[PDB]
Write a protein that binds this DNA or RNA. Structure first.
Ligand code: ZN
Ligand code: ZN
Ligand code: ZN
Ligand code: ZN
Length: 1256
RNA sequence: ACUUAAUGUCACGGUACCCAAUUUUCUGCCCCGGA
RNA sequence: UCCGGGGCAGAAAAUUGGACA
């Protein structure tokens, strides 16, 4: 009469600490522990315990089982009506039974008059224990009628004691409102394992065989026990790893202090994130050394992977360490190294019923994420690792979907389906029987684990202070995300009288068909489009409970093989299971057509990009063979076809950027983004996008790229470099590069994207969104980074038709002048040349006073202030002399290295074979001119450089001789110089944004006969500038800015090709294509939020007037690169809540702008003695502008036959190209005698000074 | 035993959720001396 | 006293703050 009962699980269950009820009544946090298994300590300490299950719980479950089984057959066994029950009374005759218990107990109506009485006891009460020697709370004997010994754990390696951290893990659970999204509270819980500790053993004894068939059959029926499924079955009869966690600590220290020796402490954090990101690639990168080896020799290497530690290269120490500890595995290796480095850096800084089954597959049509607390939550009682959040993970690194979240989301959607929502109550004494609760307590779910087991992906998110459009400090964090395209199994049970049509509603709503994308919104962070799911291969089954109960038991409820059902053939089904017809499909279901479907409405559209596009992701760049600095973002996706990551990634733009763009747009428009009372900001932005109080009402997604294959080379190298405003050469450590996507004005990129709206918007709210969309289509907000220099502009929008008609209407309804200035610089009358001979100097210097005007106040970017203007300008760029702009991406474009090794060749800057000028160069040119005009601060100047006259060393560096007032404008408090104020600086984004230049009208290539490519040139020799000759000795000072001259001295080289190629070594010449005269490029600037006279001065600077021109391009001092700019069209629009739209401006208004700007500079001069009156402006009254214009003055434009001779001096008189008898060389010009130093300085600071006879 | 009480366990009664543009600044440029 | 040669190849700041009594 002994029955050994074995228990089994199929899903991770829960555990809680043990207590006596005498003590348990106190610790309220143990109260929930009345249904979970028990875990007891042992050995007067921690970590050594035992696990069991209280027999009482098994008893209660068997009771509920017998109750249901009897309710089904209308209350009889084999036709024997039995007793209606006895419980719910137990009053005042003894102790109220421990575990006072309440729920809708049920009693069928019966006929018999015996209650399983003493002499004749129907099996039910014998099973209860009513007629025995039982005793309420006394257990003196093992004298019971039917006994339940408690169930304890089964373990094969029990020779050692179970450790708590081995079979337990902490987790947090919470609860959210029906509306407002937010959470209200949270409790803690312990989850077990179900793979290795899932068997539980017990023991049961009986006394009277008479009641067996009831119990032995009612056993298999029960399903839940301790919070999961089960199958009760009657049974017939490596410590170094830990040391590793410490030992690697040691090694970490060595790496740190060495970096401290070279004054490189901040790069530690970069190294940490990079070595973490190394997690995806695999071991190969170390064992074959695919690390981004440095540039060409440089006698150095990568600025990171080649630092020296203890006299060794880092990229070798890494291989050594991996060889040391290779038992752990690549994954934990990298993770531990990252954590250790993070911590060290942080320390250093400081009426019948039936059962319906649903099987099927879940798919995730977007990147998903479920969040958990943090690492370092050991099970018993500011260590924040370098991952501010984490995805959940299983034991073997697999993605899980815990039944908690599935249950919750199912409830929320069902609650919408009905229409009435009971906000859940805690610990009540009655049951809120609104229908939603009635359904919600009849369903059962199951967890889910995928097959993919690779590490996740990382993303970053920053904030942006709308004050100055800058990275808002103290806000930079990163989240983890799972791959898109994974698939889980999904199981949903139901038991009752009639399949509620609203359950069918929600299932259909989660379904996906040919033209219907599902919208199941599992998981958190559903605000920015993470978590959307869909269903596939739904196959609903149903039982017949009323007359096939033995067929249900014999298959143990078909629990534990829920995978077989999805794929088996209809014929091999187990007897008693039948496919479900009458599945109403999306048509008759009234709630779905009525309450669900209009929940979310989608908008879908494609942006069209017409320029290079770049979303900087600097971290990935450090682990790629490109040796670059910035790369386009990359997403990776699963593919259900091949069960592996797709071999080729996909470029995109992250959703959060989408969201930020719309947010800033609407905010800046309504003028609500600047107020600080935003926790309760009652303006419309807080209603739409949602502050912390309520949820949000817009959901974005990722911008994907589809027009990708048509391009043959997606990513095009580009280089950029600063220039010392004092010597027109490259500053030190200031030559970098980017590698963005290719985007042309003719073959534009194509990006597709979507975003959802929750039903309930009220009229004008739609108007705001539509306005912002039209505003993007106008082209004010650039996608990506580096806006001001052209990257990432937009050029149109094509709203797809399958949208709300309201949007189509609201969006579609909303969509010869400027001659030259004629300044007549008056610097004329033959330049005193007399046509005979005057060898001038290639470049000259310019002095610009000392005082600088500054403004403490700053104009913000909060909103389009009404008193200021904003618009765009179009322009055409016309060339005057052969031009050159090399393309540094290629080094053998002209195939010339096949004969003369080491000889560089280039070809003109081009994109998909469409000539084009990079804009940043135009930005630099305009900026130099504007600064020099307005007497700004030196933007980019190398202070740390010492010279030695010839040994006279420099007592102080260059920055010492230069006045302090002219040093770079550094801090926001001190104020900003007018130059830096307009174009911006490190902490204030500029307000003027240029753009690339397009190509136009004809004759193009200066054709030469002798040269092999017939259109290329071989430039002369070029050497570095020498600030020494400009500063003769110690007492000298920085003269000023540098400028190059205009002359037709290039054609000389156009006839010495054959000779130049002879004498000069091919290691120092460069050959490239050239563009001739007579070409015009398209060009345009866009400005927003300017003051009044600033725009006037900018316009004056774009075109100084007739007879004047800028300089640009490689090879300035020889004469290549004279350029003249005109204006064609101006647009200004004072955008605001008013209906004022884009309007033109006629001529004679720009006159007012320029005139007012002129007076502002008049005032800044402070010497009011200058003429004051009303007349067409005359620029050549203020001293320094006079010189500035005297410098850049095309002589040969007006008088077509007045050209001077400009050239550098030969070296030493018997130098190579020494003009005989000229006496135009050093050692007769640089000697202190025959030329006092002050006279040299004076000759360098008076433009257009005769130099061969050396007058003035 | 450590480890339960017996004519009365809705904890499958509770989603770790809300909110936050990887961005701001920078012309692919160029002459006189070294032991 | 004799006779010629390339350099720069990334620099600075931000690495988490609030919430749910
Ligand atoms: Zn009875
Ligand atoms: Zn309710
Ligand atoms: Zn608000
Ligand atoms: Zn400044």
């Amino acid at each position: 009469m002994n029955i050994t009962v074995e228990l089994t699980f199929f899903e991770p269950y829960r555990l809680v600490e043990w207590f006596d009820w005498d003590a348990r009544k106190k610790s309220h946090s143990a109260m929930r522990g009345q249904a979970f298994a028990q875990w007891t300590w042992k050995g007067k300490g921690r970590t050594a315990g035992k696990s069991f299950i209280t027999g009482t719980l098994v008893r209660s479950a068997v009771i509920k089982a017998v109750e249901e089984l009897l309710s089904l057959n209308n209350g009889k066994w084999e036709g024997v009506p039995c007793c209606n029950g006895s419980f719910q009374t137990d009053e005042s005759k003894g102790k109220k039974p421990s575990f006072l218990r309440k729920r809708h107990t049920l009693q069928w109506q019966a006929n018999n008059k015996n209650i399983c009485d003493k002499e004749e006891a129907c099996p039910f009460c014998i099973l209860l224990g009513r007629f025995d020697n039982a005793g309420k709370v006394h257990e003196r004997n093992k004298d019971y009628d039917i006994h339940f010994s408690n169930f304890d754990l089964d373990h094969k390696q029990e020779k050692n004691d179970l450790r708590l951290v081995d079979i337990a893990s902490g987790r947090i659970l919470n609860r959210v409102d029906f509306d407002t999204g937010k959470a209200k509270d949270y409790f803690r819980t312990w989850e077990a394992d179900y793979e290795t500790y899932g068997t539980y053993t017990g023991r049961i004894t009986l006394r009277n065989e008479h009641a067996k068939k009831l119990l032995l059959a009612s056993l298999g029926f029960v399903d839940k026990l301790c919070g999961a499924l089960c199958r009760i079955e009657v049974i017939k009869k490596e410590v170094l790893s830990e040391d590793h966690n410490d030992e690697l600590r040691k090694q970490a220290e060595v790496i740190v202090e060495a970096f401290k020796q070279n004054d490189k402490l901040e790069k530690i954090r970069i190294l940490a994130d990079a070595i973490r990101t190394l997690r995806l690639h695999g071991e190969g990168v170390i064992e074959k050394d695919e690390l981004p080896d440095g540039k060409e020799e440089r006698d150095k290497g990568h600025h990171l992977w080649d630092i020296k530690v203890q006299g060794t290269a880092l990229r070798t120490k890494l291989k050594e360490l991996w060889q040391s500890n290779k038992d752990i595995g690549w994954r934990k290796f990298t993770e531990m190294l990252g954590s250790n480095l993070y911590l060290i850096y942080k320390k250093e800084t400081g009426i019948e019923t039936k059962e319906w089954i649903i099987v099927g597959r879940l798919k995730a049509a977007t990147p998903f994420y479920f969040g958990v607390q943090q690492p370092s939550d050991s099970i018993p009682g500011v260590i924040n690792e370098h991952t501010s959040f984490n995805i959940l993970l299983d034991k073997e690194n697999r993605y899980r979907i815990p039944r908690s979240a599935l249950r919750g989301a199912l409830r929320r959607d069902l609650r919408t389906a009905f229409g009435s929502g009971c906000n859940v109550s805690l610990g009540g004494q009655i049951l809120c029987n609104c229908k939603v609760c009635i359904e919600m307590r009849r369903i059962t779910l199951k967890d889910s684990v995928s097959d993919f087991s690779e590490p996740p992906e990382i993303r970053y998110r920053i904030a942006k202070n709308p004050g100055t459009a800058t990275v808002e400090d103290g806000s930079l964090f990163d989240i983890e995300v799972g791959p898109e395209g994974l698939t889980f199994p999904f199981v949903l049970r139901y038991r009752g009288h009639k399949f509620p049509e609203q359950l069918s509603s929600v299932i259909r709503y989660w379904e996906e068909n040919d033209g219907k994308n599902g919208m199941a919104w599992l998981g958190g962070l559903d605000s920015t489009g993470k978590g959307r799911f869909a269903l596939k291969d739904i196959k609903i089954f149903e039982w017949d409970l009323n007359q096939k109960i033995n067929e249900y038991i014999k298959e143990r409820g078909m629990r534990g093989k829920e995978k077989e059902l999805l794929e088996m053939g209809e014929s091999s089904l187990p007897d008693g299971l039948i496919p479900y017809k009458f599945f109403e499909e999306r048509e008759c279901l009234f709630p779905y057509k009525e309450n669900l479907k209009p929940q979310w409405s989608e908008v879908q559209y494609t942006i069209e990009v017409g320029s290079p596009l770049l979303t900087a992701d600097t971290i990935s760049a450090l682990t790629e063979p490109g040796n670059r600095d910035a790369i386009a973002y990359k997403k990776r996706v699963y593919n259900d076809g091949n069960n592996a990551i797709e071999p080729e990634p996909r470029f995109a733009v992250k959703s959060e950027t989408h969201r930020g763009i719309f947010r800033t747009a609407v905010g800046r428009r309504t003028g609500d983004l600047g107020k600080e009372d935003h926790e309760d900001c009652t303006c419309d932005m807080c209603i739409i996008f949602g502050n912390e109080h309520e949820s949000s009402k817009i959901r974005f997604e990722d911008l994907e790229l589809i027009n990708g294959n048509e391009f043959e080379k997606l990513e095009k190298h580009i280089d950029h470099v600063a220039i010392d405003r004092f010597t027109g050469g490259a500053l030190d450590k200031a030559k970098f590069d980017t590698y963005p996507l290719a985007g042309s004005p003719k073959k534009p990129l194509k990006l597709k994207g979507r975003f959802w709206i929750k039903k309930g918007f009220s009229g004008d709210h739609k108007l705001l969104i539509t306005t912002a969309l039209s505003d993007i289509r106008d082209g004010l907000y650039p996608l990506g980074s580096k806006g001001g220099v052209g990257y990432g502009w937009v050029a149109g929008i094509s709203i797809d038709d399958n949208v709300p008609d309201d949007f189509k209407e609201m969006i579609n309804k909303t969509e010869g002048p400027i001659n030259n200035d004629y300044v007549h610089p008056g610097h004329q009358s033959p330049k005193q040349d007399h046509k005979n001979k005057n060898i001038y100097y290639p470049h000259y210097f310019l002095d610009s006073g000392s005082k600088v005007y500054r403004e403490k106040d700053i104009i913000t970017h909060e909103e389009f202030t009404e008193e200021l203007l904003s618009g765009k300008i179009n322009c055409k760029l016309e060339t005057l002399t052969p031009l050159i702009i090399p393309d540094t991406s290629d080094e053998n474009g002209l195939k010339l290295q096949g004969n003369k090794p080491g000889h560089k060749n280039y070809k003109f800057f081009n994109i998909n074979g469409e000539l084009m000028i990079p804009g940043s160069e135009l930005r630099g040119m305009l900026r130099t001119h504007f600064e020099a005009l307005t007497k700004s601060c030196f933007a980019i100047f190398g202070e740390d450089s010492t010279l030695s006259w010839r040994r006279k060393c420099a007592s102080k560096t260059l920055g010492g001789k230069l006045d302090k007032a002219l040093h770079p404008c550094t801090g926001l408090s001190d104020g900003l110089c007018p130059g830096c104020h307009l174009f911006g600086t490190t902490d204030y984004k500029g307000r003027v944004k240029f753009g690339f230049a397009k190509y136009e009208n004809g004759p193009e290539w200066l054709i030469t006969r002798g040269n092999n490519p017939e259109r290329s040139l071989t430039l002369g020799v070029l050497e570095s500038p020498r600030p020494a000759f400009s500063i003769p000795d110690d007492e000298s000072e920085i003269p000023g800015r540098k400028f190059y001259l205009h002359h037709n001295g290039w054609r000389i080289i156009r006839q010495k090709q054959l000779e130049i190629r002879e004498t000069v070594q091919p290691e120092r010449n460069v050959t490239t294509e050239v563009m001739d005269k007579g070409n015009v490029f398209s060009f345009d600037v866009k400005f927003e939020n300017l003051r009044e006279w600033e725009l006037g001065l900018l316009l004056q600077s774009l075109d100084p007037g007739k007879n004047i021109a800028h300089k640009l391009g490689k090879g300035k001092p020889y004469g290549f690169g004279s350029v003249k700019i005109k204006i064609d069209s101006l647009h200004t629009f004072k955008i605001n809540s008013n209906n004022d739209k884009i309007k033109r401006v006629p001529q004679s208004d720009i006159r007012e702008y320029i005139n007012k700007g002129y007076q502002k500079l008049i005032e800044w001069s402070g010497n009011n003695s200058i003429q004051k009156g009303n007349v067409l402006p005359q620029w050549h009254v203020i001293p320094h502008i006079d010189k500035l214009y005297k410098l850049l003055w095309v002589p040969f434009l007006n008088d077509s036959k007045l050209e001077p001779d400009v050239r550098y001096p030969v070296l030493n008189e018997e130098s190579k190209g020494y003009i005989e008898g000229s006496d135009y060389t050093y050692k007769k010009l640089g000697d202190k005698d025959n030329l006092p130093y002050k006279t040299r300085v004076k000759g360098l600071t008076t433009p257009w000074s005769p130099w061969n006879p050396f007058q003035v």
